[PDB]
Design a binder for this molecule. Sequence first.
Ligand SMILES: Nc1nc2[nH]cnc2c(=O)[nH]1
Ligand SMILES: Nc1nc2[nH]cnc2c(=O)[nH]1
Ligand SMILES: Nc1nc2[nH]cnc2c(=O)[nH]1
Ligand SMILES: Nc1nc2[nH]cnc2c(=O)[nH]1
Ligand SMILES: Nc1nc2[nH]cnc2c(=O)[nH]1
Ligand SMILES: Nc1nc2[nH]cnc2c(=O)[nH]1
Lengths: 273, 273, 273, 273, 273, 273
Amino acid sequence: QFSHNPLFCIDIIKTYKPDFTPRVAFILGSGLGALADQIENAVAISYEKLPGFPVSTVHGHAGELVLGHLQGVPVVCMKGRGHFYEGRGMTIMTDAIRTFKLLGCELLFCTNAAGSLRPEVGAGSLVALKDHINTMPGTPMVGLNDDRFGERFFSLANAYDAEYRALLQKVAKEEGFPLTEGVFVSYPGPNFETAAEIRMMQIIGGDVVGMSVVPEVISARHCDLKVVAVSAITNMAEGLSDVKLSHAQTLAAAELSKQNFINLICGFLRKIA
Amino acid sequence: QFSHNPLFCIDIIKTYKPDFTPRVAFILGSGLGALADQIENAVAISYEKLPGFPVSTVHGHAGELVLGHLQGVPVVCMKGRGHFYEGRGMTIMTDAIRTFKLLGCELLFCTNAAGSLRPEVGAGSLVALKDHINTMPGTPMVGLNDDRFGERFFSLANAYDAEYRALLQKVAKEEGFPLTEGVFVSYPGPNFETAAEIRMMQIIGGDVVGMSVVPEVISARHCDLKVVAVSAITNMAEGLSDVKLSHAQTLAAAELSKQNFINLICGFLRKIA
Amino acid sequence: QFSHNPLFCIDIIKTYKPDFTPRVAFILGSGLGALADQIENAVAISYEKLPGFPVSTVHGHAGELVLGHLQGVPVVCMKGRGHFYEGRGMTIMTDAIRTFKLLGCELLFCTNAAGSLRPEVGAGSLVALKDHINTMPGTPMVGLNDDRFGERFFSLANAYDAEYRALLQKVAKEEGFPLTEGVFVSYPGPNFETAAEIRMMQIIGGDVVGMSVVPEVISARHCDLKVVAVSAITNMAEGLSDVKLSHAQTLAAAELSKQNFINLICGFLRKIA
Amino acid sequence: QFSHNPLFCIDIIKTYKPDFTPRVAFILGSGLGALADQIENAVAISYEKLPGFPVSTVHGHAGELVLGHLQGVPVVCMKGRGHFYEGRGMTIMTDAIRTFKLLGCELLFCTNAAGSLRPEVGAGSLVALKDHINTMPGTPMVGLNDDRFGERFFSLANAYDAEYRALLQKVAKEEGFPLTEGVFVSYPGPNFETAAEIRMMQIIGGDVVGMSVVPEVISARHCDLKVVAVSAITNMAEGLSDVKLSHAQTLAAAELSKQNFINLICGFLRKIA
Amino acid sequence: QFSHNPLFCIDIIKTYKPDFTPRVAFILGSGLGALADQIENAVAISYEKLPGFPVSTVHGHAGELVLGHLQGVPVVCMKGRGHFYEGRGMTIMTDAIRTFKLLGCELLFCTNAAGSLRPEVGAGSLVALKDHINTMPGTPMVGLNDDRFGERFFSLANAYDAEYRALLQKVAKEEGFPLTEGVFVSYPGPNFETAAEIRMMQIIGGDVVGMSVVPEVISARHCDLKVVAVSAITNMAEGLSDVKLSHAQTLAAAELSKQNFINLICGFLRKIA
Amino acid sequence: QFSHNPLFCIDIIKTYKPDFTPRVAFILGSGLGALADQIENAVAISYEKLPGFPVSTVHGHAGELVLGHLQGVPVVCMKGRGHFYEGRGMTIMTDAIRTFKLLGCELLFCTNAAGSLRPEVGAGSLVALKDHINTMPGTPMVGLNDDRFGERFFSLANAYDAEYRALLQKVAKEEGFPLTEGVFVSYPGPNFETAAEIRMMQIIGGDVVGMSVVPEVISARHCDLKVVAVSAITNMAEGLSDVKLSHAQTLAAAELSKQNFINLICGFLRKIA
Ligand SMILES: Nc1nc2[nH]cnc2c(=O)[nH]1
Ligand SMILES: Nc1nc2[nH]cnc2c(=O)[nH]1
Ligand SMILES: Nc1nc2[nH]cnc2c(=O)[nH]1
Ligand SMILES: Nc1nc2[nH]cnc2c(=O)[nH]1
Ligand SMILES: Nc1nc2[nH]cnc2c(=O)[nH]1
Ligand SMILES: Nc1nc2[nH]cnc2c(=O)[nH]1
């Protein structure tokens, strides 16, 4: 027995936003809500009205889904996401993503706040994710497979679409800011990482560290939804600076990168219109 | 309260195969079913009739247990196994293995399809596993210990029996094919690994990567059942070639190694008769 | 809905030990019970009378909580702990630690039996833990946050208090035995580690390996309880010696370090009085 | 934590039937589907698309909700219901009824197939229920109360609305058939009643016996939805005739009363328009 | 595995009320809290601090346990109880009662608000319960038996102690008010009874009807705690008057009988001192 | 998902008793074990080896299934049964009965210890059950229906086979003892009934009262297994005598009727051979 939550969401959404077929699905992490404010003919639906959606329990996370246009592009946007640390397992973002797929989106644009594992890339930088290393226990698709959405086994080759990543490089140039590319390594949380765990992540080949992305992304590849992902660096991972880490410091430093993030997103949309 | 499933299986098996005490227990992974076809006085029992057994949900996996003689050796053979990715936890292959032990087997010969982490060893090769690194969440014996089968704590030293491994080296020589030995690293799945995860596995010391073996093997050591394990390399892990990965590609390339696998198994049996 | 077990324990404890405000909370691992015998005006309360406490299921572990004075310091002492391998998740030691906090302790002195990942440091040595790397699935605080004890997110910076660690260095000198400092890497168990997993732990930066510590420690930092931790090396991790590993050998070699452990603890208490 | 299923249904229904505020909600039992065929501008929504609705598992029961006009009255109609015997407890018909309430219905017109406990009233008769006696274990509102729909405690006085019952008496007259009024006694099922249980029901004051009605009705009174209920007598209860009971006999004899049932319903609608 | 909640409560209670061995345990239903106000040296412990106690969710019910002296008798008093309708099964009042037993009480004095099934006995009357008829599903002791408290099977003969009932008759005379004796019939609720159910209860031999008493009482007999019980008639059961039933009307009419109830309780205490 | 326990039992039983097709299945209640001692070529299988069987937890109940011949009739016999009061719901005897059906039995001969509701029939008497009245919550088949064994709905008409009951009357004559026929009313237990509940049972039409029979019997009718049932009267129900009730008194008085019970069973077998 499988979740029909995405199917119910399709119908619930037709009610608040009829004759609408979004092309891009966004997940706005901590602090990045401000972008949804600019969506054309914005219709907001609380997650409490959408079965399966991540009714927020996190600061920086709203619990709203905003549908409309942005750059004249039919877009759907999650203001707030669900994390493994909340206790509902690795499937927490799975119904939502499947909803994006059934809505007819062709890609997911995942954003998240994160720590840097490279001295070279500091707070304020934006990093395009080109791959990931999962450290959370298990994975989203563990369990009986839902044949309606994808196959039992599936490849993560080119999970972070190389083509949309090239477009992201172009937009960064055109606007005068660096857009490094890195390997994201997920961490369960909710505690931040130890300094030793961070050193282990460097050794293991990671460039960025966070508590999200992996569940959504693996879920997206399962149902054949292309993925894009960019992290807003809010600090240096633990042990890599003199700065004390907290959620308050994470919400605060996500503003140094905010304007660059908004322009990158809007420029990417212009190039795919 | 503990599982009595293996005890029930003993009795169920006496019905279909009386006065039979197998010495070797086989687990035939994806594609390797063909071997069970050559079993002497072959009696097939569907997993649906054996409490605790991995009623298949996977392509390449049958859901049959075949008992009989091979190279004149009383043998029991699993056509199909259970994996962590199916959602029933790390204990999925535990009752079955305990059944092998109560049947009186002295060793488990585990086979599995897998990806190579070494450029040197490509699709078509066979690798004898000499050890493993577990990446799946937790382990099979987590929980109350079943004193009827083994102790609370137990060693994995010489888990992949050095002696039976030497015999495997000799057989390979005697038949004209290389038999590299390697460290197996388990992965939860069902998604295949990312390229970065694969690089992390090289760094960590792994030679082979797959979604099985570890549960069965740790379960076997717990109840003092010696283990043997060989992987049929079906491809290069993610990022190590230009080849796209799928279950269809895994079932397909397990044939390049099939004849060598059959001869290795039959030659090993000959040497222990 | 949250656990009120620590609150119930406060009241249960007033009954057996009135007008008592302990400063240091101890967790005596396998073999180290002998220390609790010297507590002044020792009052023992079985874990069966304290909701949430780790009613033992492990050899070397009692299931007793001893309250009293040591070197004239109001102390509370756990004779036996709970482990992830028991099957009750990563929260197994969380209620107990919160009980220590509500009792008014200012620090946790965690002890545990462990294997060494350094040739240089053998069976009999004592190692002060300066940090850790978690390999167990998930973490203790995963799930809804209990605001009565701490915040949603929290730092592990200086988790193993640098100041109390300097005092430990001093005492060791004042008593004639090396007190190496190391990075502890947790392992789920109950099986011991494979040789390959051990090599992976060296590569990853670990110095000591065990099946406990991490749950208690992360729980302690969550509720702002300072931590101290020392491991009694009972052997070399797997593959690093010719010695066969078992719980019997772990209980046995924890005696070579016992007198040094007792003097270190008593000397540390003397310096904080 | 409470069910939001009715709220989701409101939104799902606006999609298939916009600007529609039904006044009467019908539950068509076994055999009575034929009535829904005459609904004006009939829109059918499968229960699989309505969270909480009784996805059928019973013969005679469809799993469809039909919305439209009948005798020019905005009506909503359940073709098929859920029963306690299905194993989902006494709350099985609760979300559906709450959906009727939020839709803005002012009354529920419950119909069901049933056995007679009075020799006087045989197969083919229709009986208006004036009250009930519950024999099923527990009740629908057992558990935390959902303040959004009604209060903790509530009265069943005039549960089967006396006023709408008087209208039913008039209609029956106006059409040439007797409409006896009776006390309905619920039974868990799925087995039919024993002869002794039936005698016990006579003694206890019952006139009609069945496996439904009570859950729906009590749920309706909780959220202040007026109720009407009529049973189509399909046989004499066990031990009261020579006739063998089965679901096939229940679906068959519900036709002797079908035309009278259709006219009663249509005449009642006419009088409330 | 059994509940140790009563054992924990013993210890928690010693903290708030040391060297105290109560003889009588009271359960004050809806409205009867006022009595607890006159307890000598009254110590109040919220149910949130007593594991297993009925943390209230009902109006008229506090969630406090008051210990002290009344008419100079060491007494323990529940201000508020738990009911089957709350959803935690028939065992809801079991730990509390066992706590009364371990505290050393020799009797339980259960009080409750209720409806009368006899015209003769109206709102304002007090009825001593001499026996009961259970209509709730199952019973409290269903499940594995806790040998520490009582036996597997046990008799309900003289459940409502004849001797303490004679004393109650005496006191009533000594105070000027009728004290009718009756058979109590439990009902699950939370809905009030139908008129037909009430007629069925008369037929079945009941005199009083309510939603409590039975769980507590059966639990008391199991652990050999004598019982007393008196109901404050707040109304006539459904269908027996013109009065509309609600919890507001139940809290209101429990005052007509309040002074008589207080004097009966205080006079009974006087006679057992 | 359904229970395959009966199918597993078939196979387990072939092992201990090959080429055996029993015609009659017995359930020996409390005290009646002695009969199984006389079974020809008796093979005993502990319930712990038969998935789904009532591993005993009750005095008077063994936990053994005995297969063999008796009166030269292929018979299967349960020494001990499962009851609703044990906490595993009304389905506790369902797998066992289905096992009897798959074994090929044509009838179930249910026996049980019980109390009499008729002054006329006292301790020592035997009563053939001709029907029943269920007072336990719900019924065995509640939940999804297992189509492999029977239909969703089914009749209890002639549940206690009139034909086998006539044979029972004949055998009683032929041996010189009365064999009254009565209506059995089930009670949940484990507490014995109150005197008032007993009076209610007389009023309701019952002749015998007990804590078993109903689950087994309804389960038997579901899978079309004919039923026979006889109760050994061990006492008068509560309030009908001066005798104190206990399980010890129930095991004791089941001997006054033992010889008559043995002869009745053996005579019935002779007449169906
Ligand atoms: N895990 C993790 N999440 C973050 N979010 C923002 N900064 C960080 C960080 O350093 N680590
Ligand atoms: N995890 C995993 N399993 C495999 N099975 C066959 N090839 C592979 C591979 O590359 N990875
Ligand atoms: N995990 C683990 N625990 C230990 N406890 C004592 N020695 C060891 C060891 O080598 N490994
Ligand atoms: N319970 C019950 N349901 C019915 N449905 C139709 N006839 C009957 C009957 O006699 N009893
Ligand atoms: N069940 C029930 N409880 C009550 N409490 C107060 N009055 C009543 C009544 O009439 N019925
Ligand atoms: N329920 C019940 N079971 C019994 N078993 C034996 N006697 C009795 C009795 O009186 N009542």
